[PDB]
Structure formats: structure tokens, C-alpha cells
Amino acid sequence: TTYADFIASGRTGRRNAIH
Amino acid sequence: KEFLAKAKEDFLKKWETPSQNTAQLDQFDRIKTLGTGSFGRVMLVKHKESGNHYAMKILDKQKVVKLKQIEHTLNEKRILQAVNFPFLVKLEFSFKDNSNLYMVMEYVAGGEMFSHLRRIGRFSEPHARFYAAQIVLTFEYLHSLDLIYRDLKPENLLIDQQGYIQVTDFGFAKRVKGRTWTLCGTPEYLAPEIILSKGYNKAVDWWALGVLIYEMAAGYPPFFADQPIQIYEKIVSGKVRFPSHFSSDLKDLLRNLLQVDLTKRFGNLKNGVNDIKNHKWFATTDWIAIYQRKVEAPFIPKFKGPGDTSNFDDYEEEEIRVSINEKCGKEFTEF
Ligand SMILES: Nc1ncnc2c1ncn2[C@@H]1O[C@H](COP(=O)(O)OP(=O)(O)O)[C@@H](O)[C@H]1O
Ligand SMILES: [Mg+2]
Ligand SMILES: [Mg+2]
């Protein structure tokens, strides 16, 4: 499922900016 | 129509003559770190003479310079001290010392939207709509002042004691009448025209609202991957898939906010924000009642008293260091 793929991804925590 | 005229006059007065040096560090006791971001640390502090609690953002001048954020940091403070709106955090004091810049805000005790969203999983559509409506009104206000906000995401949205939103983090906000070009923001929330280096305007904020509504209602963003580069490829293709539980009205709104073609994106057409306010997904929204904070919020955070930090994650604490030598004095003269 898309949810399962998100939770297993590396970007479920607080996200920093790019600059 | 008339309210925004009056609002622009108070804003312009403060934009043209900003407040400066309205407190000093030794007026506060530092308690606990509430959050770190890409650039600064925000601590809970207690003001000694009043007993009030505040959130103090601390920026290390040398780090700001190293990350090439001088102008952005001056924008941040100049804009935040000039605005006034129910859903924007209030800046109470600002000052600087040899090493750091300080912005002291009202403390918003309910935590980041981010934490509640990840824990609960997703918000139901009426819950997401309640938050989305507050952002629509906030962007209407900001854009009427020629401001682009440029960093909407749950990490920069706080829930107050009544369950309403407070927008924080003006680090990328900019007053601009034409186009601007800086590559800045958070990958998941970047509009295609930013990635493509085309020049861009206030429409990027309406794209980001589309991303936020999707993430609130789905529990995950519309474009994600392990590496930003792969996120960018998905954004510029513009292909979006919707969860099975999204209402038809929500899908229609999102197709119009997550529109790659600027000339078709809601918020950027002849009717401006009214295309969004008049959309069927908002048909039950009483825009005036939201502005007046007369609607009962769907979620009210728990608080055991002033100074309670239980709605925030714990962070490693670091000492505030102040050099005996002034750093970057001329660069930050106007702060
Ligand atoms: N007024 C506030 N009250 C409570 N917490 C806040 C406040 N402002 C910011 N924070 C917390 O501090 C974090 C970082 O602040 P922010 O201004 O976003 O810094 P950065 O520019 O480094 O991201 C936020 O994500 C939030 O957790
Ligand atoms: Mg932030
Ligand atoms: Mg920031």
C-alpha cells in the first residue's frame, strides 16, 4: 500500500529545508 | 475588502520603521528546547518580571552567514514584527548580542501539527478543512501585503490552546512585487516552477496548500521518495494519485491547487482567492466564524498548566554561548 511504502521510507520524520 | 486596506496601513508603518532591541537576554530564564530547525533552536523561556512564558528562537550569527541566510534572516524579523493576524504567531521582543540573534514569540503550547498528524495517522476531511480554512485566510492576508511565505508544512504549524492554528517560521518569507528566484523550501512542498528555475510568484503558496491538504487528509504527502532528487521528478510530472477515501469534492479542489500550469492554478486566476473559498469542498465553511475563532475546534490539546511542554518532543539541550567579541556586527545592523 502507499501508506506502507511511506512508513518504510526515510522521510517520515521532521523535514529540513533546502537552501 | 475594507479590513485588508486598514491592515496594510499598520503593516506599512512597521515595515518602514521596524522595532529593534526591545529586550535583553538576562530578562529571561531558559527552561527547555521546544524544537530545532534547519537554522535555529527554539526554547521555552520565562520572562522574570511578568512571569509569562515565551518561545525564544535563537540564531547563531556565524551559522546564518555560513548558510548564506543573511538577507532571509533580516526578512524574517522585519516581516514578523510588522504583521498582525489571528493565525500568525506574535513576535513580542527581539534583540541581539555578540553571538546570536533572538526572536521572542508567544508560546504556542499545543505542539506541532506534525506530531499530532503522524501519531493519529491522518485527519478526517472536516478536521483537515478546519485547518485549511485558516491557512486560506492567512495567505489571503499575507499576499495582500505582497508577501510570499514559502515554507508551509506541518512542522511550521502550531496548535494553540483553543485548537486553532498558529503559523510560525518566517525564515523564507519575502516581500516582493514581481517574480523571485531563490531555490528554498522543503522538497515535498516545492512547486514545479521553483524546481524548474523559471522565476515564480505567490502562486507557489497555493501549490503548497494543496500539498498540505493532501498530507493532512491522506497521512502522507502526494510526492515522496527517499531522496529529494526523486521527489523533484515526481513533482514536475504532476501525476497525483488519490486515496480511495478522498471525497470527489476534495479531489477536485486538489486537482486545481496541484496544477502544474500557473495559468490554471486556483489562487492565481482572475477571481484570486475566491476560487478557493467558493469551491464546493468549503461549502459548509463559515469564513467569518473561522476568522473570529467562534467555531469549536475538532481537537483540543491537553495542557496541565503554563510551561507545560508535554506536546513537544524532547531535544538534546545545548548551552547558549556568547563570545567576548562581536560577530557579524555590520551584517546585522538593522536587526
Ligand atoms: N511560537 C512557538 N511556540 C512554540 N513552539 C515553537 C514556536 N515557534 C517555533 N516553535 C517550535 O520550534 C521549531 C523551530 O522553529 P522555526 O521557527 O520553524 O525554526 P527553523 O527556521 O529553524 O525551522 C518549530 O518547528 C516548532 O516546533
Ligand atoms: Mg521551521
Ligand atoms: Mg525556517
Per-residue H/E/C for B228-284: HHHHHHHHHHCCCCCCCCCCHHHHHHHHHHCCCCHHHCCCCCCCCCHHHHCCHHHCC
Quick count: other Cβ atoms within 10 Å of Cβ B168?
A: 23
Could you tell me if B211 and B194 are in contact, meaning their C-beta atoms sit under 8 angstroms apart?
no
Active-site residue among B60, B97, B151, B314? B151
Residue A14 alpha carbon to ligand 2 centre in Å: 9
Q: How far is CA B198 from the centre of its chain?
A: 24
Three-state DSSP state, B180:
strand
Residue A2's identity, in one-letter code, is: T
- Choose among B184, B224, B225: nearest Cβ to A19: B184
Beta-strand (E) ranges in chain B? 28-36, 41-47, 53-60, 91-96, 100-106, 147-148, 157-159, 165-167, 174-175
Contact call for A17 and B155, based on CB within 8 A:
no
Cell output for B313: 518532543
Q: Strand B53-60 relative to strand B28-36: parallel, antiparallel, unpaired?
A: unpaired
- By the 10 Å C-beta count (0-12 exposed, 13-18 middle, 19+ buried), B73 is classed as buried
> Is B151 in the active site?
yes
Contact call for A9 and B226, based on CB within 8 A:
yes
Q: Strand B100-106 relative to strand B91-96: parallel, antiparallel, unpaired?
A: antiparallel
Closest to B258 in 3D by CA, of B276, B278, B238: B238
HSE at residue B264, side-chain half, CA atoms within 13 A, is 8
The residues with which B35 forms a beta bridge, in sequence order, are B42
Tally of helices (H runs) and strands (E runs) in chain A? 1, 0
- Choose among B118, B151, B219: nearest Cβ to A17: B151
Q: Can you tell me the distance from the alpha carbon of B128 to that of B122, in angstroms, rounded to the nearest whole number?
A: 9
Contact call for B220 and A3, based on CB within 8 A:
yes
Q: Number of Cβ pairs closer than 8 Å across A and B? A: 49
Cell output for B117: 498528524
Q: At what angle do helices B203-218 and B113-120 cross, to 10 degrees?
A: 40
Could you tell me if B331 and B65 are in contact, meaning their C-beta atoms sit under 8 angstroms apart?
yes
Q: Strand B91-96 relative to strand B53-60: parallel, antiparallel, unpaired?
A: unpaired
C-alpha distances (whole Å) from B147 to each of B141, B261, B292 are 9, 22, 23
Residue B11 alpha carbon to ligand 2 centre in Å: 23
As assigned by CATH, the class of the B111-294 domain is mainly alpha
